[PDB]
């Protein structure tokens, strides 16, 4: 039915003011950061040299209880680097910028939404952030600077107060999820359109959410493959522009006209 034109023109005639977007690894990719899914190319795909019985335990919280080294020794494999924001990040500042963002929604931990100045009250960190720690024993909470060098020395980060084990405030499998994921009850229903972008939906809760807007809501996902809700719980108003993320992103900023506003960001930023 609806095609990536006709999503852009609801945004050009202001049909869609209230935009929610939900975002994954997929839109990091393009920063050279790894996503977590993708055959060959994903963190599950490249982690033999870990001691790990399966890929996704050391993301587990038990497993983190039980033995916490394996999951910091792949942390000082991409604390050291440094990381900017892509095309994909700069389109969702520049819908922040005309007043169309209702509510960025994104599984990432590597804080490039916030680097793309993105104020944090329109960003729900979902799976949490690096940016601060706190100690699994006694909950102190601590700067995400303070275990950096830890985990660069070979050490598990300890706390210095009672040594418990230190962890950045990620949201691990079995871990709830921050306060702030409760917005959607407020959010989603308020939607006029939403965005998935570079996502497996194979994480709950949040996969779930692609359900919570209405039902007359567009849904536009730019992905490589047709995932989650979207392929087996289709909509009339679904879109799917398969394919790069940054192909993806680069043709709607086209038909949108923000081709201009975009470089000027770009310029500032960088
Ligand atoms: C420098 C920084 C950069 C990053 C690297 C640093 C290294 C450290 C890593 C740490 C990260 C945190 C781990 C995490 N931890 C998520 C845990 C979930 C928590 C949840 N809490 C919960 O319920 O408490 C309830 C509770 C209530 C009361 C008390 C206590 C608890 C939970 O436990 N639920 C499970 C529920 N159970 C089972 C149902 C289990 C308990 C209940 C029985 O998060 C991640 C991540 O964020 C999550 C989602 O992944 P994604 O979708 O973002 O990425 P990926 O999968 O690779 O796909 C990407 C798609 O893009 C496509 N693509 C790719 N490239 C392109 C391209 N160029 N162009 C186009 N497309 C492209 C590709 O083709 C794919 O299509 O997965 C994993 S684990
Ligand atoms: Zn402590």
């Not at 919570?212 to 996902?221: F, G, I, K, N, Y």
């Not at 909509?235 to 709607?252: F, K, N, T, W, Y």
Request: aromatic share 8%.
């Amino acid at each position: 039915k609806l095609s990536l034109q006709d999503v852009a023109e609801l945004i050009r005639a202001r049909a869609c003011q209230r935009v929610v977007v939900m975002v994954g690894a997929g839109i990091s990719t393009p920063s050279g950061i790894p996503d977590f899914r993708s055959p060959g190319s994903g963190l599950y795909s490249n982690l033999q040299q870990y001691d790990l019985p399966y890929p996704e335990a050391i993301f587990e919280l038990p497993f983190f209880f039980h033995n916490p080294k394996p999951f910091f020794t792949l942390a000082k494999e991409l604390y050291p680097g440094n990381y900017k924001p892509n095309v994909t990040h700069y389109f969702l500042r520049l819908l922040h910028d005309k007043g169309l963002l209702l509510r960025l929604y994104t599984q990432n931990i590597d804080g490039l939404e916030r680097v793309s100045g993105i104020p944090a009250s329109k960003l729900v960190e979902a799976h949490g952030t690096f940016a601060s720690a706190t100690c699994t024993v006694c909950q102190r909470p601590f700067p995400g600077e303070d275990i950096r060098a830890d985990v660069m020395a070979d050490r598990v980060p300890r706390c210095p107060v009672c040594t418990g084990v230190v962890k950045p405030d990620i949201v691990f499998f079995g871990e709830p999820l921050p306060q702030r994921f409760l917005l959607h009850v407020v959010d989603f229903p308020m939607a006029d359109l939403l965005l998935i972008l570079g996502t497996s939906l194979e994480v709950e809760p949040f996969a779930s959410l692609t359900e919570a807007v209405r039902s007359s809501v567009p849904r536009l996902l730019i992905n490589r493959d047709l995932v989650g809700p979207l392929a087996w719980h289709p909509r009339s108003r679904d879109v799917a522009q398969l394919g790069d993320v940054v192909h993806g992103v680069e043709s709607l900023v086209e038909l949108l006209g923000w081709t201009e506003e975009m470089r000027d960001l770009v310029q500032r930023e960088t």
